[PDB]
C-alpha cells in the first residue's frame, strides 16, 4: 500500500480511474466536435472554439482526477480512450445536444462516484468531487441547456442564420 | 422534465422554493429593522445601515437560491413574502435579538434542506447549501450573538448611551 | 406625533405605505421575470439581467419611499408582498408587455399619490414624487414601450430569432 | 446553552476540543523537529524552516478549530499539550517519516471527526472539516510522502549528501 | 559536548529549557484568553486580538530561547505544556490581571535565569536575556498594569460599558 | 469532395488521420509518464512537469494536424487512443528512454507521411510537415537523447540521487 494512502477504498480508486477515462473520452468527444466545426463545409469558428475549450477543460478535469489519485496513494491505470460515437455532428444544435448528453452522463458518473465515496466514508473524496466536478458539471449542463434552448428557438438547424448568429453572439 | 434536470428530486425543488421564500422574508424583516432604526425617534444610523445590509444580503441569498433552482432544472414558484411580525422593533438590542432568532430559524431551514438533499442523495445541492449558506449562517449567527452580548453588557436598552455607542463603535 | 412631522397628512402617510408595498411588489414581479428568463428552457440572459435590474431599481424606489416616510415623521407599516400574478411569463415580448403594464400601474399609483399630496397641500411630498418617481416612471414606461414595439416588429415570440437578437442587441 | 449554538452536538464539541489538542500537539512536534534541525550537530536550516512552518500551520489549524468552536457556541476546553515523543529525530529522513506518521494520525482524527459530524447530522461541521482540514491533510501527507520517497531514493540518512542536497533543493 | 558549546553551564541549559517551557505555557494561556474573548457570550474582539498577539509573542519568545539553546550548543528538551489554570477568564479586567500575573511570573523566571547566568559567568546568556526578554517583560508588565488600571477606573467588570469601550479604544 | 480540397490525395488524408491518432497516443503516453512521476513513491515533480508539457505539446501537434486536415478539405476520422503500453515507467531514465523511443517512432511516422506527400506531389503537405513537425521531432529527440545520456552518466536509476538531481537541475 502507498505510504500516503489512508481511508481510500480500492473500489474508490477504481471508480476514480474510470472517471479519469470518462473525462478523457469527453475531452476527445469535444475535440471531435471542434474539428467538425472547423470543417470548411461547417465553418462555425466560435462553435469550434467553444468545443475546443470544452475539450481542454475535460482534459484538465481528467488531469485533476489523476492528481487526486496520486494524492490519495491510488495508482492511475489508464485505459483506451474510445473514439467518439461519430465524426459528423451534423449541426451546431445537434453538437450542443450531444454535448449536453455527454455532460449529463459525466455528471451521472460523478454522482455515482460521490455516492461510492459516501458509502466508503471517504469525506475527502466526496469534498473533492463536490468542490471541483459537481458544481462544474451543473454549470456546464445549464450552459449547454441554454445553448440548446437558444438554438432550438432560433430555428436551428433548419434556419441557417440561426446557427451562424448563435456562433457570433452567444459563442463569439 | 427540464433538459438540465439531473438527480434533483421534486421535493428538493419544493424545499428550495420554500427556502427562497424564507430568505426573501428575512430580507423583508431586515428591511423593516433598518426602517425602524431610520426613524427620527430611534435615529440609529449604523443600526439601520447594518440591517439594510442584512436585508440586501438576504435578498442576494434568495437570488442565489433562484439561480440554483434554475441551474438544476427546477422551477421557481414564488409565494407571498409575509410582512415582518412587527413594525416597531423597540430597541437596537431587541432588533439584534430578533435578527439572531431569524438567522437561527433560517439556519434551521437550511439544515433541514441539507438533510433532505442528503436523504435524496443530491451531493451538488448539499455542497451548494454547505458552501454558500451554512457557513454564512454560522458566521451571521455568531456576529449577531456577539452584538446581542455586547448590547446586553453595555446596558441596552435601559442604558440609552449603550445603544448609541454600540451604533458608533461596533456598527460604525 | 413625530417631532419632525409637519404638513404631513396621515392619509399621505398611508398612501406612502401603500406605494412602498406597490414598489416592493413591482420589485418582486421583476425578480420573477428575471428568474423566468434565467430558466434553461428560456435562457435569455440579457432579459434576465434587465428584469433583475428593474427588480433592484424597484427595491431602491421602495427604500427611498421608506426613507421619505421616516424623513417626514411618518411610520412605515409594511404589508405582505403579494406573489407575482404568474411564474411563467411565456416570452420576452409578454414579459416586456407585463412590465409595461406594471410600470403603468405604478405610475398611476404615483400619480394618485401626487394628487393626494397636492390636495393636502404637501409641496415637499409632491416635489419628492415628481423628482424621484414620476420622471423615472415616464422614462421606464417609454423604454418598455420601445422594447415591446421592437419585439413586436421583430416578430416575437413567433419569430424565435427575434427575442434572441433583442436580448443580444437591445438588452446586451 | 450558548445563544448561537444550533445543531452542534455536545460530543461534536468534545471531538473538536480533542482535535484542538491534537493540532496543538502536532504544532509542538513540528517545533521539536525544527529545533532538532537547528542543532549545530544537525545543521539542516531548510529542514528546520520546513518543520517550523509546519508547526506554525498546525498552530493555525488549532486556532481555526477554536474559532469554529466559538462560532458554533461550543466551549473550548484546553488540555495539556503533551511533549513530543522524542527530542532527537535522528535524521531528516526519520523526521520526515515521523511527520508523515503524525499527519496521517491527525488526518485519521479529522476523519473520525467528520464521521461523528455526519452521524450527528452537522453539515456545517462536516463542511468546515472537509474544506479546511481534509484537503490540507491530504496535501500535506502527499508532500511528506514525496519528501520521504526522495530522501530514501537519495540514500538518506546513510548517504550524508542526500539530506544536505534535499535540504538545499527540495526544502530550499 | 557540542562542538559550539563554550562557557555554557549545564544548569544554564536546564534553566533555558525550563524558560522555553514557561514561555510556551504563557503562549498557551494567552491563547486560552483569546479563545475566551472570542466566545459569543463575552465577544470582545479586541481583547481576543490582544491576547492572541500576546500568545504569538510568547511563542516567538520561546522560539528565540530554542534558537539560543541551539546557538550555545545546548540541547532543547521540551516538556508538557500544562493547560492554562482555567478556561473561563470571567472578564476583560480579570483576564488582564491574570496576564499581568503571568508576565510578572515570567519576568521572575527570566530574572532567576539572569541571576544564574551571572553566577555561572555567562555574559552572552546574560546579555541575551537582558536584551530580548527583560526589557520586553518590563514593557509588557507596564502595559498590562496600564490596562488593568484603566479597566479598574472605568468600573470594569461591573460597569458593562467599561470593558466594551476599553476594547474599542485601548485595544482597538 | 470538399470545396477547398486541392491536390490532397486520399492517401494523404488517411495518413494525416493516422498521424493525428499517433500524436494523441503520444500525448496520452506522456500524460501517463507525468502521472507516474507524480506518484508519492516516485515523487519527481520536474519529471512529471516535463512529461505533462510533452503530453500537452503532443496534443497541440495533433490539434495542428486536425487543423491541417480541415484546411485541406480532408475529413478527420478519429480512432481509439490506445492506452500507453505500461502504467509503471519504473524510472526517470526508463521514462526518458521510452519517451525517446516514442518520439523516434513519431518522427518515423512523420517521415513516412512526408514521403507519401512527396510521392503524391503535395508540396503544401510536405512543407507543413517539415516546418511544424520534422524540426520539432529532431529537437525533441535530441533533447531526449541528452536527457538519457545525462541520466545514464549520472548513474540512474541505481544512483538514486542521480534522478533527483537531474529533476532539480535539468528539468527544474
Ligand atoms: Fe546540486
Ligand atoms: Zn516572553
Swiss-Prot record, chains A, B, C, D, E, F:
Q: Which residues form the signal peptide?
A: none
The catalytic activity, as recorded, is: 4 Fe(2+) + O2 + 4 H(+) = 4 Fe(3+) + 2 H2O
Name of the gene encoding the protein in the UniProt record: Fth1
Q: What top-tier enzyme class does this entry carry?
A: oxidoreductase
The cross-references to PANTHER family, in alphabetical order and at most eight, read: FERRITIN, FERRITIN HEAVY CHAIN
Which amino acids does the record list as binding Fe cation 2?
A: 58, 103, 137
Q: What is its EC number?
A: 1.16.3.1
Q: What name does UniProt use for this protein? A: Ferritin heavy chain
Q: Which organism was this protein described from? A: Mus musculus (Mouse)
